[PDB]
């Protein structure tokens, strides 16, 4: 025999950031359709209008308390461009140290505190119970206990990462230390010692616990490398400038779609709204001409997330996207465990192959590998920084200007565009990471990246449909970012 249709709605999707409803159509044990709804709106793009442009680098951080340094960074880059501010070299490096520390925080938070319960049974008390009666928790008693022990240790490690952010960022969430013109606090020798001491502890945890546990848990869920492919299409806009030219970055830009690498041209971004709660006349706009006119009663729409498309393509973003586009060498422990636990011989990230990389478990692997990769970048910046050297310039506010800041938030590509008129914000448009991942259909009916990645996900037990949200969580969504 076989089974017919069951339609399953999950609201709230938990162990993500923000407000998401997912609805899937299951036929014969697999998802055959999906709709994702961002169910909360604030409207930062209209709140920002009329303000002193410098206020943006504080206001925008409140889009998302998990990734505020990403919004800080995109905003100050946009303001730097609009103001003609020339960030001193030492300020560029200080910014990289502030922001890079939150990559470590965010990926560790994501794997352990958001994702790991997908595979690990926590202690027998809230918030770890109750849960699905058949949660498909496959780990041995010993390995499950390692997961719990590491979850608990990771609470301290992620906190230490925020201490690293705050050393030159002031506090976290919501840094004070990035402004137009650079960074507000010159690193001292003494505080660089404090950053390095914390960094060593984080490094040890990443190398010894986090990267190994992802491959080890993955080896008990090998079926999870065979689903979640979606479009197999990715975007990277570049991040972490490595010199003052604006042309060299830790993550270099690129698009990948239909098996082909292509350059990134931001003029090909358009945001569609047919299936989003925004006025119909605002559909199809590039961000330099973007408009944000809510329409919460518009028939047929199902999300406050706009639908960004790149030259018509629906793309995903995040660690997988960046690691696929840039194809770095894999970590030593990843190479070893791919051989020992999977029989896979691999040297660089693409040696996983397109199918396994673009998968539910591949996205967790990519995020762990990227965390390891960031260690080397931060170590480099700690050698490059010059204690005592100025990190900021103080530029006058222009009467009329525009600028765009591009970076990679922990969850994927982020840009902020600002237009200044009469010395105030005339328009401010944000195109964020979880916008690229968790958006609804476009005006042609083409699904968003996660919607498409849900197709084919197995649901062999409609009463315990655990793989639907497991797939969603692999993308590390934050709906605050997606909607703003």
């Amino acid at each position: 025999g076989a089974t017919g249709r069951t339609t399953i709605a999950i609201d709230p999707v938990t162990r993500i950031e923000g407000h998401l409803k997912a609805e899937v159509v299951v036929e014969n044990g697999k998802v055959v359709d999906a709709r994702l709804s961002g169910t909360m709106y604030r409207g930062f793009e209209t709140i920002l209008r009329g303000r002193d442009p410098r206020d943006a680098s504080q206001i925008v951080q409140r889009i998302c308390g998990v990734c505020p340094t990403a919004h800080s960074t995109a905003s100050v880059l946009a303001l730097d461009e609009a103001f003609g501010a020339k960030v001193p070299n030492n300020g560029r490096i200080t910014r990289n140290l502030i922001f890079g520390a939150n990559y470590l925080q965010s990926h560790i938070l994501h794997f352990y505190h958001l994702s790991a319960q997908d595979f690990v049974q926590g202690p027998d008390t809230a918030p770890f119970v109750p849960r699905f009666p058949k949660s498909d928790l496959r780990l041995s008693k010993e390995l499950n206990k390692a997961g719990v022990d590491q979850y608990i240790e990771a609470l301290e490690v992620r906190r230490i990462c925020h201490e690293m952010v705050a050393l030159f960022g002031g506090r976290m969430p919501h840094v004070q230390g990035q402004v137009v013109g650079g960074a507000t606090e010159i690193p001292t020798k003494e505080k660089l010692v404090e950053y390095a001491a914390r960094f060593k502890k984080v490094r040890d945890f990443v190398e010894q616990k986090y990267v190994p546990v992802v491959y080890t848990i993955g080896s008990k869920y090998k079926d999870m490398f065979k689903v979640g492919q979606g479009f197999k299409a990715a975007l990277c806009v570049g991040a972490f400038p490595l010199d003052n030219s604006g042309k060299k970055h830790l993550f270099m830009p690129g698009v990948y779609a239909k098996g082909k690498d292509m350059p990134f041209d931001p003029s090909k971004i358009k945001e569609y709204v047919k299936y989003s709660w925004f006025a119909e006349e605002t559909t199809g706009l590039n961000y330099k001409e973007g408009k944000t006119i809510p329409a919460p009663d518009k028939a047929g729409a199902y999300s406050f997330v706009k639908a960004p498309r790149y030259d018509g393509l629906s793309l995903e973003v995040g660690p997988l996207a960046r690691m696929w586009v840039n194809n770095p060498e894999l970590s030593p422990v990843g190479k070893k465990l791919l051989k020992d636990l999977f029989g896979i011989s691999a040297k660089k990230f693409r040696d996983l192959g397109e199918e396994a990389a673009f998968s539910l478990m591949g996205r967790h692997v990519a995020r762990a590998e990227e965390t390891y990769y960031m260690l080397g970048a931060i170590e480099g910046w700690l050698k490059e920084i010059k204690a005592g050297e100025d990190t900021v310039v103080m530029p006058a506010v222009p009467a009329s200007a525009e600028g765009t800041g591009f970076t990679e938030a922990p969850r994927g590509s982020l840009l902020h565009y600002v237009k200044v008129k009469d010395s105030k914000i005339d328009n401010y448009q944000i195109v964020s990471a979880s916008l690229w991942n968790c958006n609804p259909r476009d005006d042609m009916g083409q699904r968003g990246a996660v919607e498409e990645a849900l197709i084919g996900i197995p649901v062999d037990d409609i009463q315990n449909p655990v793989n639907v949200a497991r797939l969603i969580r692999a993308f590390d969504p934050x709906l605050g970012c997606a909607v703003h």
């Binding site: 609201d11 206020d55 504080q58 998990v66 906190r159 506090r171």
Partner: protein, 283 residues
């Protein structure tokens, strides 16, 4: 606390928040967040961290709420948007019925022992209620009052609050309740709230009057660039003079920095944040 001790039930509902008030709590040093969750409270519903999901998570909260009617603590993070019949914030769906933040506060608000409005958005409206917004973002206390809901509210503001203000206010309340019972205990908490509903142990002192750069302010020695750490930050936009918080002493993130040392205070705990504290970078 102990793993086997008395731990009251807590539901954490997110309206128009950024999750920063959850993240800041995760940064608590002592007690650690692990100890808070396993030894101090029973966090029965929290969408960012809980095991279950969807209608099952909502129904779990409803079952606990029935068992502990009048006795659970309700944490609200984010503002409550009232425009468009609540559609700017849907928090869940159960029995094919969407649950707006408006609906959720009308359902659980009346049955809580107390509502802890965590963060400036929940306490005062904050950025979602600021100029240029259009969702009807409303503060918790105003929403509850407008709807005839008398449950006590304690505001723990900041954008985000310091973890110590959140955990410390919980500890304040749990101590008062241990000594006096629930109604007598909450009466003792209300007695130590300022006119903006904030606990005076954390919000009873002014930043500027306790600031290490106060001598420079009085001398008129003002930094002209952020990286000059000798002068006062007033000309760079510091709002310490108008701000009631203890950041000058407890500082942030394990004591490693704070806003005035690093840059400027933006007045994030104040009821008029952000508009009455803006522009941030001039006096």
């Amino acid at each position: 606390g102990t793993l086997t001790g008395e731990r009251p039930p807590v539901f954490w509902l997110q309206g128009q928040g950024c999750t920063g008030c959850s993240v800041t709590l995760l940064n608590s040093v002592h007690p650690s967040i692990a100890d808070v969750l396993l030894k101090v409270i029973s966090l029965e519903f929290h969408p960012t961290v809980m095991a279950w999901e969807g209608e099952h998570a909502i129904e779990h909260m409803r079952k606990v709420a029935e068992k502990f009617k009048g006795k659970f603590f309700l944490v609200i993070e984010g503002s409550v948007p009232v425009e468009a019949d609540g559609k700017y914030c849907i928090i869940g769906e159960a029995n094919h019925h969407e649950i707006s933040m408006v609906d959720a506060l009308k359902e659980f608000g009346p049955n809580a022992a107390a509502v802890l409005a965590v963060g400036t958005c929940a306490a005062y409206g904050g950025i979602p209620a600021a100029e240029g917004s259009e969702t009807g973002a409303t503060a918790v206390s105003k929403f509850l009052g407008d709807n005839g809901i008398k449950t006590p509210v304690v505001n723990i503001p900041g954008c985000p609050p310091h973890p110590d203000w959140i955990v410390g206010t919980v500890v304040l309340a749990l101590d008062a309740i241990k000594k006096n019972g629930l109604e007598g205990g909450l009466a003792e908490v209300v007695k130590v709230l300022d006119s903006d509903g904030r606990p005076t142990p954390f919000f009873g002192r002014n930043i500027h009057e306790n600031c290490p750069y106060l001598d420079k302010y009085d001398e008129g020695v003002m930094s002209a660039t952020f990286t000059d750490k000798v002068g006062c930050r007033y000309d760079l936009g510091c709002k310490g003079p108008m701000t009631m918080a203890d950041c000058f002493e407890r500082k942030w993130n394990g004591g490693v920095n704070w806003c005035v040392q690093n840059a400027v205070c933006i007045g994030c705990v104040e009821p008029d944040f952000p508009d009455g504290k803006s522009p941030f970078y001039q006096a």
